[PDB]
Amino acid sequence: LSDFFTQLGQDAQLMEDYKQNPEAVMRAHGLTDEQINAVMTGDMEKLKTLSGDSSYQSYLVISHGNGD
Amino acid sequence: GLSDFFTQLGQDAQLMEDYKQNPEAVMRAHGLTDEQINAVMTGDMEKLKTLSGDSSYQSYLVISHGNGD
Amino acid sequence: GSLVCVGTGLQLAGQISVLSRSYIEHADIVFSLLPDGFSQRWLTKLNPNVINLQQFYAQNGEVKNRRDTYEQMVNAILDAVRAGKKTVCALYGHPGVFACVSHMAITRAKAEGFSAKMEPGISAEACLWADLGIDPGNSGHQSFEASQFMFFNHVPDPTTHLLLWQIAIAGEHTLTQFHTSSDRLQILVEQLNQWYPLDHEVVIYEAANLPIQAPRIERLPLANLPQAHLMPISTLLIPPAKKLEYNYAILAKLGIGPEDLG
Amino acid sequence: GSLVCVGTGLQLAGQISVLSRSYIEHADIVFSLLPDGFSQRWLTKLNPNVINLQQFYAQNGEVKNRRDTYEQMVNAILDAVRAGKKTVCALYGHPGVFACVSHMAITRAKAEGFSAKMEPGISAEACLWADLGIDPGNSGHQSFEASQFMFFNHVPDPTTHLLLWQIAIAGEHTLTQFHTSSDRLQILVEQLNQWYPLDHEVVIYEAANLPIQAPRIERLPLANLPQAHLMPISTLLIPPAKKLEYNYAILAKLGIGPEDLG
Ligand SMILES: Nc1ncnc2c1ncn2[C@@H]1O[C@H](CSCC[C@H](N)C(=O)O)[C@@H](O)[C@H]1O
Ligand SMILES: Nc1ncnc2c1ncn2[C@@H]1O[C@H](CSCC[C@H](N)C(=O)O)[C@@H](O)[C@H]1O
Numbered sequence: 264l265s266d267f268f269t270q271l272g273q274d275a276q277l278m279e280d281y282k283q284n285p286e287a288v289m290r291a292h293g294l295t296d297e298q299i300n301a302v303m304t305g306d307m308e309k310l311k312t313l314s315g316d317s318s319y320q321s322y323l324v325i326s327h328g329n330g331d
Numbered sequence: 332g333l334s335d336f337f338t339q340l341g342q343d344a345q346l347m348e349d350y351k352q353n354p355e356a357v358m359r360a361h362g363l364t365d366e367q368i369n370a371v372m373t374g375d376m377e378k379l380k381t382l383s384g385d386s387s388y389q390s391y392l393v394i395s396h397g398n399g400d
Numbered sequence: 401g402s403l404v405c406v407g408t409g410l411q412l413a414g415q416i417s418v419l420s421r422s423y424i425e426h427a428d429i430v431f432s433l434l435p436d437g438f439s440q441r442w443l444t445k446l447n448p449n450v451i452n453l454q455q456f457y458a459q460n461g462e463v464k465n466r467r468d469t470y471e472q473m474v475n476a477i478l479d480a481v482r483a484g485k486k487t488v489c490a491l492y493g494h495p496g497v498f499a500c501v502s503h504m505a506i507t508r509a510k511a512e513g514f515s516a517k518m519e520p521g522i523s524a525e526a527c528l529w530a531d532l533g534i535d536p537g538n539s540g541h542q543s544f545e546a547s548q549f550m551f552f553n554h555v556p557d558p559t560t561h562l563l564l565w566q567i568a569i570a571g572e573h574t575l576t577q578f579h580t581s582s583d584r585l586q587i588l589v590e591q592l593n594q595w596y597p598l599d600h601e602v603v604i605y606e607a608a609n610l611p612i613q614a615p616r617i618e619r620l621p622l623a624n625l626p627q628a629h630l631m632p633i634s635t636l637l638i639p640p641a642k643k644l645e646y647n648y649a650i651l652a653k654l655g656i657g658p659e660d661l662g
Numbered sequence: 663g664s665l666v667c668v669g670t671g672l673q674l675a676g677q678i679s680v681l682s683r684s685y686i687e688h689a690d691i692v693f694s695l696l697p698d699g700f701s702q703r704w705l706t707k708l709n710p711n712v713i714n715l716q717q718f719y720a721q722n723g724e725v726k727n728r729r730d731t732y733e734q735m736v737n738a739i740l741d742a743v744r745a746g747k748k749t750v751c752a753l754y755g756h757p758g759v760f761a762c763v764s765h766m767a768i769t770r771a772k773a774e775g776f777s778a779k780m781e782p783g784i785s786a787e788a789c790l791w792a793d794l795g796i797d798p799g800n801s802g803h804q805s806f807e808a809s810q811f812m813f814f815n816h817v818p819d820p821t822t823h824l825l826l827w828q829i830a831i832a833g834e835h836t837l838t839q840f841h842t843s844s845d846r847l848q849i850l851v852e853q854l855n856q857w858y859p860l861d862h863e864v865v866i867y868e869a870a871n872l873p874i875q876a877p878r879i880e881r882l883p884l885a886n887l888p889q890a891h892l893m894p895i896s897t898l899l900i901p902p903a904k905k906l907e908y909n910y911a912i913l914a915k916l917g918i919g920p921e922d923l924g
């Protein structure tokens with residue numbers, strides 16, 4: 264999962280291949296049926312469980328509006 | 332020469348930090364002339380474009396207006 | 401030692417600048433604040449010497465002022481620079497956009513006699529213009545932190561695209577909770593009603609962090625904001641309430657009229 | 663055929679996204695609008711099949727409405743897409759920040775039934791926050807095109823960092839000249855004097871395009887703007903004239919006061 268996503272996010276040729284036929288590209292890179300279903304339903308929580316890190320809690324607020 | 336150095340320095344964090352420590356030494360070693368180094372140290376971007384081979388690359392960069400659609 | 405703060409962008413692996421990636425690659429040590437585990441994995445393959453800044457956020461239901469979180473983040477970064485390490489701080493998006501930690505670390509590092517600089521990155525706002533196909537220049541742009549808009553006197557120009565950032569914590573005054581409440585967002589709605597009708601279409605926007613993920617672009621009337629599902633990464637876009645109208649006063653000083661505009 | 667609009671950022675070679683560089687690399691053809699000859703050389707090495715959009719600007723002192731320039735740019739891009747080319751438009755900075763050509767091309771391509779998308783990039787504003795060590799969230803941010811600020815009704819919040827873009831053509835109503843006049847800038851000063859004192863320190867900012875180049879960060883009183891040296895790339899930064907003041911009305915509805923703020 265992590266290997267595919269990292270390649271796909273950097274490589275414009277693989278990105279254009281993905282956009283033409285997402286299911287064919289995900290299967291060619293070994294993604295399971297439930298991984299593909301997670302992608303097509305947009306379940307980002309499920310993909311995080313299947314990769315290994317939804318135990319990884321992530322809070323992303325790095326500023327406040329109270330001044331000083 | 333001038334172009335190849337700038338393209339490398341712009342992308343390579345190791346060369347960028349070498350350049351920051353000793354700008355003249357790094358520029359001499361990559362073959363920049365005394366006049367090219369002087370243009371850099373005085374911030375004369377006009378002269379640097381001449382020494383590169385400008386051939387009048389005129390570059391107007393406004394791609395919008397404020398007159399409404 | 402030395403400090404370079406960089407941004408990784410919102411998207412996994414591909415939205416970092418070529419130079420910024422190089423800075424991470426060659427760093428003695430990296431202090432990270434990234435969106436997810438895929439991004440964390442990608443960083444650790446680039447440079448294994450990583451300290452996750454995520455640890456400094458309140459853990460297991462503790463009460464912690466975010467001011468203390470950020471102080472601890474800045475101190476952690478500076479301890480590596482003071483030791484002599486070529487230090488990189490790798491924050492998601494742009495390291496200096498609605499992020500105090502990099503600015504504070506750079507100010508503190510310069511004051512203690514260390515080389516420190518920030519490299520710009522692609523922010524969530526940069527992703528919004530792309531995703532929604534909106535140009536900030538079209539009728540102007542304003543950005544405010546949602547809680548700062550509630551606590552202090554800010555006046556929006558309703559001809560602009562207005563962004564309220566950190567909308568998920570709007571009105572959360574203690575800096576100890578991870579989200580606000582429906583009653584706080586209803587007070588924001590009533591406050592915005594000074595300039596925007598209750599039926600005015602607003603957009604809850606979330607830029608994607610993965611290449612297989614679509615952005616969130618949820619259109620709803622302003623009145624329905626308090627019932628909406630919000631996440632810490634949610635930005636509220638409030639498109640213009642009014643069209644642009646001629647400044648006859650200034651046209652008169654320029655000695656022209658609207659018919660004269662190109 | 664298909665369209666992808668990307669940005670190259672402001673700095674030569676290093677300030678493009680990893681993915682955006684890959685899009686240029688693999689393109690059938692690239693339509694470019696880059697800052698200088700170094701950047702043009704760099705692009706031509708990446709992909710030799712380049713059409714320079716610079717050619718559509720007024721040449722040799724001709725009188726040409728920029729609206730016609732921009733229409734011709736969009737038409738040139740769409741002619742490649744219609745022919746069946748995998749087409750990339752590579753603009754400097756962010757391709758959709760104060761840039762109509764990419765948004766227009768994408769709109770037109772989608773309407774003609776072609777794949778079109780915009781990849782975000784690092785804008786001159788993203789450069790400004792880093793180079794000045796200013797966070798747009800600290801007291802908020804507003805951006806206007808300078809001429810639009812003069813011609814239409816816009817009201818700045820003077821607690822914010824205010825950016826006037828394309829200051830160098832402020833008030834140039836024809837869209838046929840490359841720069842404005844000091845008299846037009848003096849009218850802009852008087853207009854701004856509704857909120858900012860004449861002795862208010864403003865900043866003329868120019869992000870560097872080369873790695874050996876320092877940014878321009880020129881501090882001067884607002885009064886001196888009309889005599890200042892401006893270039894087309896100059897952005898006017900107007901820092902806050904007033905500190906943030908407590909919004910007692912909203913605080914009371916929240917049932918809190920200043921002393922309760924974390
Ligand atoms: N994925 C995302 N989509 C939209 N907005 C986001 C986002 N991630 C962060 N933000 C915005 O940023 C706020 C945190 S402040 C950090 C912003 C970050 N430096 C950047 O460059 O984007 C969030 O509350 C939200 O308003
Ligand atoms: N080097 C630079 N430094 C500062 N502002 C710049 C700049 N290059 C362009 N700009 C600003 O952008 C305006 C042109 S509009 C195009 C902006 C570009 N898409 C970007 O993302 O930055 C200029 O008039 C100026 O206000």
